[PDB]
Design a protein around this ligand. Structure first.
Ligand SMILES: *[C@@H]1O[C@H](CO)[C@@H](O)[C@H](O)[C@H]1NC(C)=O
Lengths: 37, 32
């Protein structure tokens, strides 16, 4: 939720997950919501 | 790459960008 995938704080929607590949760890700055790098 | 969209005097535009959305506005005027 800091460098990979951010949600806004007015979210209208549903979040789903179930039990069943890299991920970023260093970048200069935060993210804006619903934006990718 | 991800997105694609093909569809069928002073010309004025406003481009705004927020929450991962690019809003585009448009005007037209028949006339520096
Ligand atoms: C947008 O991308 C630029 C790349 O030059 C970066 O400097 C900037 O920090 C990015 N925006 C945010 C909110 O991190």
């Amino acid at each position: 939720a800091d460098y990979n995938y951010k949600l806004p704080d007015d979210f209208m929607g549903c979040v789903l997950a179930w039990n069943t590949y890299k991920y970023r760890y260093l970048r200069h700055g935060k993210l804006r919501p619903f934006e990718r790098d | 790459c991800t997105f694609e969209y093909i569809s069928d005097h002073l010309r004025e535009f406003v481009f705004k960008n927020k929450d991962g959305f690019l809003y585009v506005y448009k005007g037209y005027q028949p006339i520096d």
